Amino acid sequence: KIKNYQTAPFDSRFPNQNQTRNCWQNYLDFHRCEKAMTAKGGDVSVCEWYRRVYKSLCPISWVSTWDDRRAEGTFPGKI
Amino acid sequence: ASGGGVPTDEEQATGLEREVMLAARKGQDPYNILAPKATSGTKEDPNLVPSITNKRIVGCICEEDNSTVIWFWLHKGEAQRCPSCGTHYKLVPHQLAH
Amino acid sequence: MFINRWLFSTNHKDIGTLYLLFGAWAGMVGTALSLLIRAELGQPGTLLGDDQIYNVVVTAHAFVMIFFMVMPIMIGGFGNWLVPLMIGAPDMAFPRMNNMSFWLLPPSFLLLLASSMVEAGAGTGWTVYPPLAGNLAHAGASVDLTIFSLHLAGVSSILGAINFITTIINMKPPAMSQYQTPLFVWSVMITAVLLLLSLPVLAAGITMLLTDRNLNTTFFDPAGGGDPILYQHLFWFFGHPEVYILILPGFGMISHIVTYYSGKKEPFGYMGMVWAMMSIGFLGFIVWAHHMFTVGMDVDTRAYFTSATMIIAIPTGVKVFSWLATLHGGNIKWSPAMMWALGFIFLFTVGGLTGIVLANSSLDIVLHDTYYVVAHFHYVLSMGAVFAIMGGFVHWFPLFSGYTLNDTWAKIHFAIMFVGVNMTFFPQHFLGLSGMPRRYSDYPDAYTMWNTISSMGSFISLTAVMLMVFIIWEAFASKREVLTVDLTTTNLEWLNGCPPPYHTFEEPTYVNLK
Amino acid sequence: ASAAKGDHGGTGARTWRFLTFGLALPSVALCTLNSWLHSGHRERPAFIPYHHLRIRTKPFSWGDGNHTFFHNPRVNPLPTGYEK
Amino acid sequence: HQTHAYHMVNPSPWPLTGALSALLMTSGLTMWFHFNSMTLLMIGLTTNMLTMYQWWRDVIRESTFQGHHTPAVQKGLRYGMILFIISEVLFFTGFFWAFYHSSLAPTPELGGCWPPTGIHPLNPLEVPLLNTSVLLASGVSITWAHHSLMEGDRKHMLQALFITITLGVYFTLLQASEYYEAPFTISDGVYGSTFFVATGFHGLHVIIGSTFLIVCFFRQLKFHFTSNHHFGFEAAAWYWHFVDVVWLFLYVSIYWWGS
Amino acid sequence: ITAKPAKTPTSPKEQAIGLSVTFLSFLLPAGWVLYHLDNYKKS
Amino acid sequence: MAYPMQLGFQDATSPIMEELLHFHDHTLMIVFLISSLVLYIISLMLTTKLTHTSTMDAQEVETIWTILPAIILILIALPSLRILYMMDEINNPSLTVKTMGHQWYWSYEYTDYEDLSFDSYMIPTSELKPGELRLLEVDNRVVLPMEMTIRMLVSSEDVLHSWAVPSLGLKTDAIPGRLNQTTLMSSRPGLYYGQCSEICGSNHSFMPIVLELVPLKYFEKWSASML
Amino acid sequence: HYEEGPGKNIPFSVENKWRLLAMMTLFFGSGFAAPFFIVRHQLLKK
Amino acid sequence: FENRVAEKQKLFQEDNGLPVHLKGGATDNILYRVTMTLCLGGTLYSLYCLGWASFPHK
Ligand SMILES: CCCCCCCCCCCCCCCCCC(=O)OCC(COC(=O)CCCCCCCCCCCCCCCCC)OC(=O)CCCCCCCCCCCCCCCCC
Ligand code: HEA
Ligand code: HEA
Ligand SMILES: CCCCC/C=C/C/C=C/C/C=C\C/C=C/CCCC(=O)O[C@H](COC(=O)CCCCCCCCCCCCCCCCC)COP(=O)(O)OCCN
Ligand SMILES: CCCCC/C=C\C/C=C/C/C=C/C/C=C\CCCC(=O)O[C@H](COC(=O)CCCCCCCCCCCCCCCCC)COP(=O)(O)OCCN
Ligand SMILES: CCCCCC/C=C/CCCCCCCCCC(=O)O[C@H](COC(=O)CCCCCCCCCCCCCCC)COP(=O)(O)OC[C@@H](O)CO
Numbered sequence A: 001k002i003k004n005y006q007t008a009p010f011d012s013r014f015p016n017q018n019q020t021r022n023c024w025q026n027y028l029d030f031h032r033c034e035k036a037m038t039a040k041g042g043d044v045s046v047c048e049w050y051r052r053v054y055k056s057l058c059p060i061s062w063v064s065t066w067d068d069r070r071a072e073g074t075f076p077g078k079i
Numbered sequence B: 001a002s003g004g005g006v007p008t009d010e011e012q013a014t015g016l017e018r019e020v021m022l023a024a025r026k027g028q029d030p031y032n033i034l035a036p037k038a039t040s041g042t043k044e045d046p047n048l049v050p051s052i053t054n055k056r057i058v059g060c061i062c063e064e065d066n067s068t069v070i071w072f073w074l075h076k077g078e079a080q081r082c083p084s085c086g087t088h089y090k091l092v093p094h095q096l097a098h
Numbered sequence C: 001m002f003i004n005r006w007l008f009s010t011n012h013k014d015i016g017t018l019y020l021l022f023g024a025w026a027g028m029v030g031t032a033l034s035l036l037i038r039a040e041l042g043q044p045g046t047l048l049g050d051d052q053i054y055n056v057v058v059t060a061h062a063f064v065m066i067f068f069m070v071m072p073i074m075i076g077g078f079g080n081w082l083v084p085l086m087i088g089a090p091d092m093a094f095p096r097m098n099n100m101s102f103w104l105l106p107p108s109f110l111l112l113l114a115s116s117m118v119e120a121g122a123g124t125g126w127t128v129y130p131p132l133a134g135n136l137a138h139a140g141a142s143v144d145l146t147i148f149s150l151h152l153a154g155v156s157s158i159l160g161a162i163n164f165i166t167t168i169i170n171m172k173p174p175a176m177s178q179y180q181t182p183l184f185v186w187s188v189m190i191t192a193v194l195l196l197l198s199l200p201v202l203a204a205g206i207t208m209l210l211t212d213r214n215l216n217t218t219f220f221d222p223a224g225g226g227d228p229i230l231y232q233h234l235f236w237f238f239g240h241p242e243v244y245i246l247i248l249p250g251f252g253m254i255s256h257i258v259t260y261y262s263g264k265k266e267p268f269g270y271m272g273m274v275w276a277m278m279s280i281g282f283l284g285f286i287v288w289a290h291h292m293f294t295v296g297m298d299v300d301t302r303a304y305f306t307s308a309t310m311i312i313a314i315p316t317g318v319k320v321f322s323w324l325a326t327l328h329g330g331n332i333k334w335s336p337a338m339m340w341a342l343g344f345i346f347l348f349t350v351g352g353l354t355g356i357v358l359a360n361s362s363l364d365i366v367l368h369d370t371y372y373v374v375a376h377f378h379y380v381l382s383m384g385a386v387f388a389i390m391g392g393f394v395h396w397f398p399l400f401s402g403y404t405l406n407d408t409w410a411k412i413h414f415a416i417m418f419v420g421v422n423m424t425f426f427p428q429h430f431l432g433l434s435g436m437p438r439r440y441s442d443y444p445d446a447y448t449m450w451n452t453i454s455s456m457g458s459f460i461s462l463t464a465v466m467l468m469v470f471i472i473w474e475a476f477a478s479k480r481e482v483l484t485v486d487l488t489t490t491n492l493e494w495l496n497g498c499p500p501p502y503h504t505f506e507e508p509t510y511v512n513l514k
Numbered sequence D: 001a002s003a004a005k006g007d008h009g010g011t012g013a014r015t016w017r018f019l020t021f022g023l024a025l026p027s028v029a030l031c032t033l034n035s036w037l038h039s040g041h042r043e044r045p046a047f048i049p050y051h052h053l054r055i056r057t058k059p060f061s062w063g064d065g066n067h068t069f070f071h072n073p074r075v076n077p078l079p080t081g082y083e084k
Numbered sequence E: 001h002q003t004h005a006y007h008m009v010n011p012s013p014w015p016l017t018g019a020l021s022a023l024l025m026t027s028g029l030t031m032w033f034h035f036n037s038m039t040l041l042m043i044g045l046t047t048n049m050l051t052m053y054q055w056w057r058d059v060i061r062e063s064t065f066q067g068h069h070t071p072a073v074q075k076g077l078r079y080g081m082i083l084f085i086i087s088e089v090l091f092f093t094g095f096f097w098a099f100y101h102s103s104l105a106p107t108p109e110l111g112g113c114w115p116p117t118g119i120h121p122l123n124p125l126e127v128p129l130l131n132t133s134v135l136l137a138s139g140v141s142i143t144w145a146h147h148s149l150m151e152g153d154r155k156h157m158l159q160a161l162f163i164t165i166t167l168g169v170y171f172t173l174l175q176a177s178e179y180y181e182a183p184f185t186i187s188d189g190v191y192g193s194t195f196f197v198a199t200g201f202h203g204l205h206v207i208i209g210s211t212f213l214i215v216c217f218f219r220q221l222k223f224h225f226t227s228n229h230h231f232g233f234e235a236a237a238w239y240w241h242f243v244d245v246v247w248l249f250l251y252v253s254i255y256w257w258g259s
Numbered sequence F: 001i002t003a004k005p006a007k008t009p010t011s012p013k014e015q016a017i018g019l020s021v022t023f024l025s026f027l028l029p030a031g032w033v034l035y036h037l038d039n040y041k042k043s
Numbered sequence G: 001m002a003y004p005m006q007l008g009f010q011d012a013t014s015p016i017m018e019e020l021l022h023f024h025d026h027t028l029m030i031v032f033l034i035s036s037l038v039l040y041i042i043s044l045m046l047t048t049k050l051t052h053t054s055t056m057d058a059q060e061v062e063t064i065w066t067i068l069p070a071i072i073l074i075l076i077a078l079p080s081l082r083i084l085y086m087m088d089e090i091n092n093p094s095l096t097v098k099t100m101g102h103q104w105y106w107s108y109e110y111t112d113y114e115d116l117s118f119d120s121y122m123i124p125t126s127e128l129k130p131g132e133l134r135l136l137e138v139d140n141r142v143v144l145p146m147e148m149t150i151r152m153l154v155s156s157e158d159v160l161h162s163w164a165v166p167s168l169g170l171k172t173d174a175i176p177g178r179l180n181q182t183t184l185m186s187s188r189p190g191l192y193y194g195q196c197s198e199i200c201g202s203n204h205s206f207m208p209i210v211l212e213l214v215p216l217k218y219f220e221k222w223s224a225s226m227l
Numbered sequence H: 001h002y003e004e005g006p007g008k009n010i011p012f013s014v015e016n017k018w019r020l021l022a023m024m025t026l027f028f029g030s031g032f033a034a035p036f037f038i039v040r041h042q043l044l045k046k
Numbered sequence I: 001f002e003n004r005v006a007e008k009q010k011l012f013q014e015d016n017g018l019p020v021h022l023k024g025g026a027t028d029n030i031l032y033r034v035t036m037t038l039c040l041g042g043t044l045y046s047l048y049c050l051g052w053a054s055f056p057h058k
């Protein structure tokens, strides 16, 4: 599908200056999709668009802290 | 049954409270709680201004709803007039109700 | 006798006197701080050190000018002196609580001075935004001492607001309606309402900063789900009303001064003046986020705050035009007081109009956190608040002291100050449009001429401040005793003589209802 | 309303005492029942060292600077987990 | 000698000892927070008690014993107290704003949910409901006390006021127990922060208001109050209703909607 | 306004002293500090 | 950037900053008009021995003192609000760049495709090269493609900062725990300078912002070069 | 009672204009100086 | 208990020119002196602590 990807497009769920949730949402959606695939032996590849949006939007230090905490068992979001 | 035990103002009020309370029972205003009601303010019928000395500041609201008040000292002696409207006032010295 | 009188006072006049003295001393401290600011910026490079010592000076400058100079002079000083006299009251409602309002201020100031002496001071701005004001970027006692200083200043002004409101509501002559009180009394009642409602919100904010710094709360810390923007809301909820608090008693004194030296028995449009001050008081509670146009707020919020901020111009215009209408057909006395008042009308108008420019969130993106904000607020504070304080001081000194000033010396002082403040702040507009940030110890080279002229102007203002001290000494030194004052018939505060006796209106005024 | 009595209209003190002993204190007695029945200690949760909890940016000014003011060993883990 | 009804107060040291107390408590907290010493704080707390005691003692001396409280002085004190309570309402308003700010837009650090991940809120139907019932009851009992005093009934006043205080003290002992038993702390992010600081300031107001009521109880014991002059009792009853209402707003907001 | 002549007139000489003393009380202490800034920054 | 003795705004680099110039001119005309009118009327009131000191009725005239200012506020608000909603309206960025504020420098992250991130520090005065501007130069400039809609996201990993480029009419606060969006479109190649616009401690004055606006092809090769 | 009238409703003497000049000079002087001595105090630290 | 307000009214209206804070007799003086001693002493200790805290340590 649409994978002449330049950057995350406008998302009407997050139309204002504060884009924190946009980053966070796409970070949750990717790692949720990821879990519901390494599960049924399916392809992570369907999860790709979330991966590209959260990587476009999210500060590196955020992703890094979120990834460290998933590993530690302290990630406060539901995945 | 109210068993009582609670004093009244009549029994226990003292000092200036008691004075205000007794003066009011007699229809008197020695401590200037009430706005005086004007006369016609002619030289014949001057506004009577009680005082415990020989001068007292008058404020004159010349017309109803005037925001501006005209202030002047009123001395014992001949009726004086408001500098703005000429309404007459006369000082009525007595000694203080101690 | 001396302690009974000056430490144990329950007298509205004496406590007003204590406030004027405290205010004058604070003004000196604030002036020194303003000269350090402008010494550092007076030539390109670094004079004192990096941004910390500089922003400790800038922070202290503001706390001192606002909480120790303007509020105590205008409200504690002119307020306690004039309000009881202007309504023929024997004193204030809570004369003993009144005295505690005053004695909280020295310890408040001791806490501010302690903050600046301990560690590296509080280099936070007077806004004290976290996380910079927090226990990681401002580790140690400096910010806590600042918070405790504001707590004591806060309690002083809340108890004083209760005092002024109660006094003005309850202790007028029986026949005097609120619509027969002079505008200065209106201006203090409305100021006291803003204080009563705004300061407790600030107390909540800075208390939350106190607990984030010392009890591991996370009100403003994202780690615990907190938001630094919350503090900005709580602070500015107080902070905008705070600026209307700083000017309203100013408006009051200007209305009296313009009326008096126009040889008028009354100000033009009395009820319009009352309406205007009450509108400004109300509107000043629904506009705070105009201090927050760059924090990332949604477009519709930005559009509300732009529009609500701008509407304040209407009621404010009615006061300005009404002062001009008071001058109209006056038998003009060109007293020093009148000169301060005329300067006020014009320079306050300029400050207000540049406020209106900043109200437009679009322009504010470029002007925010630049010297254009600094030009706006010094026009309305250093030429509004201060001009109203100088006019009132000159006007009422003879009432308070029983002595007259040298009028020629006073005209000289006005002239030096006028040049000083205009030279200091007019060029800061240029610095702002061209992008010079606030709270900078040094600027890119292009900014050098306007910073040089601005610093030179700051020195002319120092000369006026020093002259002022001499003028007050000359008056007490020479002892010209007052005889006669025109227009007592519409200025009750003069009618008990100069100075009035310790106890006035022991016998209340006589005012009848027709 | 979720309320339906009648107007007591026979001297105020007597009516308010009526309400104190008739409604107020009976409510307090029922809620005291309901609470000294749902009480008793309860399954404390698995300690997870979440970063938004057990916040420590500065030591507390009492004890060892790591215990909160009303620290309950049973139910309040330290940042390093429950106490031994 | 005056022909107005207002109170010219004797020169008083208590404003100065108040100010200095403020200095000693603020500088004391600084020394406690940063230089590990409580001595300055203990002194400011002591002088502050002494000041409050002697200041309010003098007000009783001025009123009950000297008769300075004319209807005009009393009217003024009514305005004073209403205005004080308004200022206290805005103070709490700050904490509610903080609560609603954090709880309506939970940040990622919390799990983007309210309550935050890892927070097991108190059951609002348990001791919180009991506490609600207790303050509401004390509201009824203080009203019985007010009517008793107006109807000249000394015994029933002392009875109704005793009950009101006992409920005040009950509420305070329960809240102390909830505090000890709560599995979360002030340091558990913005949930712990808003919870303990809002309910904590409330708790202080309950202790302050209980203390006021107890003052009123002993004054009533010593027959200070007439059936028509008892502003101290009215002021404490206004304060007490204020405390009651702040609780209802905390219960609805933090304990019920915020769980 | 009207006023009595000065009870204790302050001659030009007296004003010159008071103005001088007044300016010096502001300028000397600040001047001392500003002049010695370099010595502070080193120490 | 600003030049010596500058009075007004830095020259417009985006169409939004151009629109702000025209709106500032409109407003400033109104400001000069009103403040000069007030000064004129003050002097008019003060320049006659003629007098009228008796009670002036104040109703017919308070209409004018209220309706005229209301009309003028509206004449400002209209254009003010057109520009506000214009700034906001949906465009489609070709590119997203994050900037993190720090004590005391900016980090930039271009993470649409590759993992490109670097630190941008003020050039010290003692290491300026001939012709370089004291307090404004950085070691690593923010290279961006000219004539293209770019999404800037702003945050901080410590205290408040604020990311500002007066030429493009940009100021977005940098708040830890928060991601602030703004859009950026340079009509021209060049260097565009700005400075940290929120007090952030010891070196607030000394963490500037330099954008280098070049064609897309030079932009792409630069990015590849910085991995 | 307390003293009333010019020069007597104040907590400082104006009995001698030179003593007064000394007082006013300490008073305003100490205020104006304070910041300079705080800047000094902070620079003579670290 | 009995109502002894009248006695207290007599004591506090006695025309001895004492301010209300001292009019109860010798304890008012003792207590006033204790309060002022703590306030003024405490203030001097507060200034010592500021001094101490204004200079660096270990
Ligand atoms: C001029 C220096 C003054 C410094 C004095 C300071 C000392 C204090 C005393 C003070 C002595 C006053 C000096 C005259 C004022 C000049 C203002 C001006 O030209 O400002 C222009 C703009 C900037 O706009 C521009 O940018 C466009 C103008 C382009 C210039 C024209 C060509 C000139 C060639 C040279 C310049 C570069 C051209 C290219 C650049 C292209 C533009 C980007 O600045 C601004 O906005 C400034 C902010 C104004 C906000 C205050 C509102 C007005 C209140 C006072 C009015 C009273 C009426 C009295 C009525 C009159 C009564 C007598
Ligand atoms: C009332 C408030 C007030 C007043 C009067 C002033 C007056 C002055 N201010 Fe201040 N200023 C602020 C409040 C005030 N300021 C605030 C709130 C800030 C922002 C702080 C921040 O960013 O955190 C600020 C910021 C500020 C900056 C920017 C700092 C920065 O961004 O880096 C500068 C630089 O020039 C400055 C300079 C001056 C100067 C030269 C004066 C001169 O005009 C002063 C001249 C002297 C006087 C006006 C004396 C007044 C004295 C008396 C009236 C006593 C007499 C008393 C009696 C007669 C009874 N100020
Ligand atoms: C006395 C103090 C005082 C007063 C009265 C005001 C009055 C106003 N202020 Fe200001 N302000 C400050 C003190 C004051 N301010 C301070 C200290 C700050 C900075 C705080 C900080 O950040 O440190 C500040 C900051 C500030 C900002 C934020 C800028 C930024 O940080 O980006 C804004 C934005 O809207 C603003 C607007 C206004 C407006 C619209 C008025 C209006 O009330 C003015 C209304 C008056 C007039 C308009 C003139 C009179 C009217 C007429 C002659 C009639 C006709 C006029 C028109 C039709 C327009 N102010
Ligand atoms: C931690 C919680 C804190 C709460 C603590 C509470 C303690 C309160 C103590 C109670 C003791 C009260 C009174 C004892 C006797 C004193 C003499 C004063 C009474 C008096 O003088 O009045 C009498 C009232 O007796 C009458 O029948 C009326 C009698 C009314 C009072 C007694 C009954 C009160 C019992 C309350 C229990 C509530 C719990 C409910 C549980 C059941 C659930 C449904 C006679 O008057 P009357 O003509 O009937 O009415 C006219 C008005 N007086
Ligand atoms: C049940 C009722 C409570 C009775 C009170 C008794 C004892 C001390 C408490 C004082 C009450 C103060 C209220 C507001 C201040 C801070 C919050 C205190 C609320 C509280 O008591 O919270 C406790 C923490 O106390 C802590 O750390 C804090 C310990 C105390 C530190 C004092 C803080 C002083 C700072 C406040 C400055 C006041 C500013 C007011 C300004 C006035 C207006 C201008 C909660 O315990 P925990 O172990 O975290 O969780 C329970 C786990 N089982
Ligand atoms: C007024 C209530 C507002 C609630 C929402 C308004 C509109 C929403 C539409 C639907 C209504 C119900 C649903 C709730 C919606 C939640 C809104 C929200 O989420 O608001 C949050 C803040 O709320 C907060 O604490 C708000 C607290 C602000 C208080 C304002 C000051 C009032 C003080 C007055 C004092 C007088 C008190 C007298 C005593 C009775 C955070 O905002 P965000 O989403 O992070 O970003 C949007 C920003 O740009 C806002 O400018």
Ligand SMILES: CCCCCC/C=C\CCCCCCCCCC(=O)O[C@H](COC(=O)CCCCCCCCCCCCCCC)COP(=O)(O)OC[C@@H](O)CO
Pocket (backbone or CB within 6 Å): C093, C094, C095, C096, C097, C098, C151, C152, C155, C158, C162, C200, C203, E007, E009, E018, E019, E021, E022, E025, E026, E048, E051, E052, E055, E058, E059, E062, E063, E068, E073, E077, E080, E081, E084, E087, E088, E091
């Ligand atoms: C973190 C540390 C910060 C601590 C700072 C605290 C500052 C000071 C502490 C010491 C203050 C306590 C001492 C007692 C004060 C008593 C006030 C009082 O009771 O004042 C009354 C007036 O206000 C009235 O009524 C009603 C008003 C009552 C006010 C009671 C005292 C308030 C103290 C707290 C202020 C909180 C402000 C609100 C925001 C939270 C009485 O007026 P007087 O003029 O005395 O007499 C008049 C005579 O006619 C009476 O016969």
Ligand SMILES: CCCCCC/C=C\CCCCCCCCCC(=O)O[C@H](COC(=O)CCCCCCCCCCCCCCC)COP(=O)(O)OC[C@@H](O)CO
Pocket (backbone or CB within 6 Å): B012, B013, E052, E056, E057, E059, E060, E063, E064, E065, E069, E077, E081, E208, E209, E211, E212, E215, E224, E225, E226, E229, E230, E231, E232, E233, E235, E239
């Ligand atoms: C850790 C430190 C915190 C503090 C600890 C505890 C502090 C306080 C405990 C509670 C204090 C209440 C005591 C007040 C008693 C004063 C006496 C009184 O009540 O005085 C009355 C007047 O009211 C008046 O001044 C009205 C008096 C108004 C008092 C208001 C009290 C509440 C404020 C307390 C401080 C709030 C702090 C807020 C914290 C953020 C006297 O007039 P009447 O009663 O009509 O009698 C006259 C008749 O006898 C004639 O017939």
Ligand SMILES: CCCCCCCCCCO[C@@H]1O[C@H](CO)[C@@H](O[C@H]2O[C@H](CO)[C@@H](O)[C@H](O)[C@H]2O)[C@H](O)[C@H]1O
Pocket (backbone or CB within 6 Å): D008, D009, D010, D011, D012, D015, E136, E139, E140, E143, E146
């Ligand atoms: C969920 C609600 C929580 C309740 C908390 C407490 C509520 C306090 C309400 C205000 O207090 C009372 O209001 C009643 C006004 O209706 C009056 O009663 C009385 O009025 C008359 C007094 O003679 C008697 O006849 C009546 O029986 C009696 O109701 C009484 O003046 C007044 O003090």
Ligand SMILES: CCCCCCCCCCO[C@@H]1O[C@H](CO)[C@@H](O[C@H]2O[C@H](CO)[C@@H](O)[C@H](O)[C@H]2O)[C@H](O)[C@H]1O
Pocket (backbone or CB within 6 Å): D061, D062, D063, E036, E037, E038
């Ligand atoms: C607006 C009103 C605000 C004012 C709030 C008043 C706060 C009251 C704090 C009381 O603190 C307690 O007192 C104990 C002793 O008396 C402490 O011992 C502590 O402090 C000592 C410091 O010297 C150490 O030596 C001890 O080890 C250490 O446990 C104890 O732990 C602490 O809980």
Ligand SMILES: CCCCCCCCCCO[C@@H]1O[C@H](CO)[C@@H](O[C@H]2O[C@H](CO)[C@@H](O)[C@H](O)[C@H]2O)[C@H](O)[C@H]1O
Pocket (backbone or CB within 6 Å): C035, C036, C039, C462, F026, F027, F028, F029, F030, F031, F032, F033, F034, F035
């Ligand atoms: C920020 C507003 C204030 C700025 C404007 C005030 C400046 C006016 C000068 C006032 O003060 C004096 O200047 C002297 C120099 O002329 C200094 O003496 C210094 O230099 C002398 C000769 O140059 C030596 O003899 C002295 O020992 C040495 O202290 C002296 O200490 C300083 O007080």
Ligand SMILES: CCCCCCCCCCO[C@@H]1O[C@H](CO)[C@@H](O[C@H]2O[C@H](CO)[C@@H](O)[C@H](O)[C@H]2O)[C@H](O)[C@H]1O
Pocket (backbone or CB within 6 Å): E035, E036, E037, E038, E039, E043, I037, I038, I039, I041, I042, I045
């Ligand atoms: C009349 C009113 C005025 C009364 C006079 C004031 C009394 C002055 C006492 C001075 O002694 C202080 O006592 C502190 C404690 O009380 C000591 O701190 C101590 O605090 C802890 C003891 O509680 C120790 O564990 C710490 O090591 C140590 O810093 C501290 O050295 C010292 O300055």
Ligand SMILES: C[C@H](CCC(=O)O)[C@H]1CC[C@H]2[C@@H]3[C@H](O)C[C@@H]4C[C@H](O)CC[C@]4(C)[C@H]3C[C@H](O)[C@]12C
Pocket (backbone or CB within 6 Å): C271, C272, C275, C318, G059, G062, G063, G064, G066
């Ligand atoms: C009605 C009231 C008081 C009149 C009085 O009792 O003296 C007056 C005082 C100020 C008046 C207002 C001011 O004149 C400002 C406005 C002027 C406009 O002409 C009408 C609306 C306007 C808002 C006025 C309405 C009304 O006439 C007000 C509110």
Ligand SMILES: C[C@H](CCC(=O)O)[C@H]1CC[C@H]2[C@@H]3[C@H](O)C[C@@H]4C[C@H](O)CC[C@]4(C)[C@H]3C[C@H](O)[C@]12C
Pocket (backbone or CB within 6 Å): B005, E154, E155, E158, E159, E162, I001, I002
């Ligand atoms: C002692 C006094 C009776 C004599 C008099 O009125 O002075 C009575 C009146 C009401 C009584 C109080 C009230 O009934 C309320 C309480 C009831 C408890 O059972 C005992 C203590 C309690 C606090 C009582 C103590 C004391 O017996 C009081 C105060």
Ligand code: CUA
Pocket (backbone or CB within 6 Å): G101, G102, G104, G160, G161, G162, G196, G197, G198, G199, G200, G201, G203, G204, G205, G207
């Ligand atoms: Cu970063 Cu200022």
Ligand SMILES: [Cu+2]
Pocket (backbone or CB within 6 Å): C239, C240, C243, C287, C288, C290, C291
């Ligand atoms: Cu504002």
Ligand SMILES: [Mg+2]
Pocket (backbone or CB within 6 Å): C294, C368, C369, G162, G197, G198
């Ligand atoms: Mg900013």
Ligand code: NA
Pocket (backbone or CB within 6 Å): C040, C041, C042, C043, C044, C045, C046, C047, C441, C442, C443
């Ligand atoms: Na510099």
Ligand SMILES: [O-]
Pocket (backbone or CB within 6 Å): C240, C243, C355
């Ligand atoms: O403003």
Ligand SMILES: [Zn+2]
Pocket (backbone or CB within 6 Å): B060, B061, B062, B063, B070, B082, B083, B084, B085, B086, B087
């Ligand atoms: Zn008349």
